[PDB]
Design a protein around this nucleic acid. Structure first.
Length: 49
RNA sequence: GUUCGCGAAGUAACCCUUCGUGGACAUUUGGUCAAUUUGAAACAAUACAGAGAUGAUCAGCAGUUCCCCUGCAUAAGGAUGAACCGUUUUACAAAGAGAUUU
């Protein structure tokens, strides 16, 4: 079970670690961007332009 | 200011000096530029991570670029110098069959 599960973990390893960290970084860009828009929508319902 | 020419005074003085006059010598610099923020250097300070193939640890050389840096450089180095991976629909048809409006 352990060896078969590790084998089907490694056969999924399609993207490289630079592509993995780029998917990670683009996810962080979308999360920071939606947090920035969240903060702006709060300050815009507040009135602070 | 220097010189050349002339006149007038000292002065009935061809010496000298003064005053006045005409000429000549000499003729248009420098600034794309103003002396602390507000016409733009970048590093460093904080905090976190901490490298391209994949199971790990790595040598690289390249390519694209509306990214450059260090380099005297057409050498070399900068993590293989860095970003590359992300979305992803129509030069769009033809034949055949049934179920529908008239």
């Amino acid at each position: 079970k352990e060896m078969l599960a590790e084998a089907r973990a490694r056969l999924l390893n399609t993207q490289g670690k630079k592509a993995t960290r780029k998917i990670r970084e683009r996810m962080l860009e979308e999360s920071k961007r939606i947090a920035e828009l969240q903060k702006r929508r709060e300050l815009k319902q507040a009135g602070i332009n």
